[PDB]
Amino acid sequence: SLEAIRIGEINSYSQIPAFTLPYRNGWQLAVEQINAAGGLLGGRPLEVISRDDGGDPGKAVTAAQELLTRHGVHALAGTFLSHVGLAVSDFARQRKVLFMASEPLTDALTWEKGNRYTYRLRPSTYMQAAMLAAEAAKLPITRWATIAPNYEYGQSAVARFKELLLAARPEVTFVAEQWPALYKLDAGPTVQALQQAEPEGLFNVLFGADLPKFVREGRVRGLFAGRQVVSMLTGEPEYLNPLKDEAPEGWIVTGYPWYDIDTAPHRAFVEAYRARWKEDPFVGSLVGYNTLTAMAVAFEKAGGTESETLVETLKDMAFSTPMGPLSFRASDHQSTMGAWVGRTALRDGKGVMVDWRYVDGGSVLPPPEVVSAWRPAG
Numbered sequence: 402s403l404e405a406i407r408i409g410e411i412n413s414y415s416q417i418p419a420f421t422l423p424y425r426n427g428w429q430l431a432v433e434q435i436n437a438a439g440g441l442l443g444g445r446p447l448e449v450i451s452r453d454d455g456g457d458p459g460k461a462v463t464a465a466q467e468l469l470t471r472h473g474v475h476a477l478a479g480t481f482l483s484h485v486g487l488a489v490s491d492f493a494r495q496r497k498v499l500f501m502a503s504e505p506l507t508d509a510l511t512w513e514k515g516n517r518y519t520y521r522l523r524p525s526t527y528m529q530a531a532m533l534a535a536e537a538a539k540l541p542i543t544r545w546a547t548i549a550p551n552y553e554y555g556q557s558a559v560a561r562f563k564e565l566l567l568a569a570r571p572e573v574t575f576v577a578e579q580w581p582a583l584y585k586l587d588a589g590p591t592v593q594a595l596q597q598a599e600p601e602g603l604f605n606v607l608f609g610a611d612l613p614k615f616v617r618e619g620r621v622r623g624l625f626a627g628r629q630v631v632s633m634l635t636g637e638p639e640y641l642n643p644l645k646d647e648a649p650e651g652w653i654v655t656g657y658p659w660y661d662i663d664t665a666p667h668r669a670f671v672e673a674y675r676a677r678w679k680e681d682p683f684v685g686s687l688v689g690y691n692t693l694t695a696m697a698v699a700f701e702k703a704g705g706t707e708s709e710t711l712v713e714t715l716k717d718m719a720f721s722t723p724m725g726p727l728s729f730r731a732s733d734h735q736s737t738m739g740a741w742v743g744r745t746a747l748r749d750g751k752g753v754m755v756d757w758r759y760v761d762g763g764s765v766l767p768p769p770e771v772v773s774a775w776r777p778a779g
């Protein structure tokens with residue numbers, strides 16, 4: 402038996418299965434394909450040992466330690482919540498082991514709290530806020546209100562949206578901010594506070610379980626009528642689909658219009674996923690698939706599992722995905738994975754995105770010289 406290459410993956414399987422179950426389907430698909438094609442480094446099988454974090458930073462770090470000390474994993478991967486990602490990243494820094502963050506979005510993972518051992522796949526809060534702020538900047542309104550879950554992710558998303566919109570439109574004013582605790586939205590009073598401030602536009606960061614509550618209560622109380630809504634992640638099917646015919650219309654969102662992407666590599670992924678799982682993909686599926694693909698490429702290009710070489714190998718490293726080649730920047734360890742921007746609509750009683758475009762991640766990233774200086778000096 403040849404020794405496996407082992408990846409320790411940690412995620413919120415118990416807390417946000419809407420994302421994490423299709424995500425696991427995606428990374429498992431990638432692993433199966435890699436092993437069927439001969440494995441890595443002369444035939445070594447790729448193995449993922451996965452753990453639940455309960456959506457908790459402490460539990461995630463305990464899991465990381467167990468993966469290292471009981472299973473001798475060669476790298477860590479995953480997480481969903483931004484503060485959980487930050488905790489696992491700091492642990493990885495201390496232990497000098499690769500951590501490939503998949504889904505946590507805060508730009509703090511690559512910038513303010515960036516480190517040698519941490520790389521991150523998905524487009525960050527900054528990146529998605531840049532996409533959305535550029536759209537908001539074209540609207541002939543000035544009065545904005547924000548609503549976001551009150552933890553690292555929501556805080557970063559709102560801070561970046563405000564910064565980027567104000568830079569484009571110095572006359573914009575932010576007339577209200579609402580900060581429900583994650584998964585604990587008190588919809589009535591929150592909606593009323595937004596209405597009271599008489600905004601023209603709303604910027605929303607609620608996702609998952611919080612989103613339908615906000616959509617429904619906003620509608621009941623007339624919050625959305627005559628207002629523009631700009632909303633991070635709302636076009637991702639894991640959040641949009643459960644709303645069914647109550648999906649919001651005309652919102653400007655980031656999301657994943659997988660049903661309408663016609664390019665061959667993406668269709669190949671959709672069909673391989675459907676054949677394997679008998680389910681449609683969600684954005685989590687693409688995230689899982691890309692994460693394990695990128696990691697497999699890193700091991701293969703490194704020629705081994707040794708941590709320092711592995712980390713060096715990822716600098717400016719390209720990897721093929723269902724959306725074409727992506728790379729990890731040497732400067733901030735951020736992948737060039739982008740997102741899709743467009744408007745929500747109903748199609749046959751289901752939420753979809755229309756008038757959308759793919760925005761490559763590089764196009765909304767500051768230059769390497771700029772981001773390098775935002776990282777810790779040691």
Ligand SMILES: O=C(O)c1cccnc1
Pocket residue numbers: 481482483484504505506507554608634
């Ligand atoms: O906390 C995060 O980074 C987060 C929130 C929603 C979706 N993906 C990531």
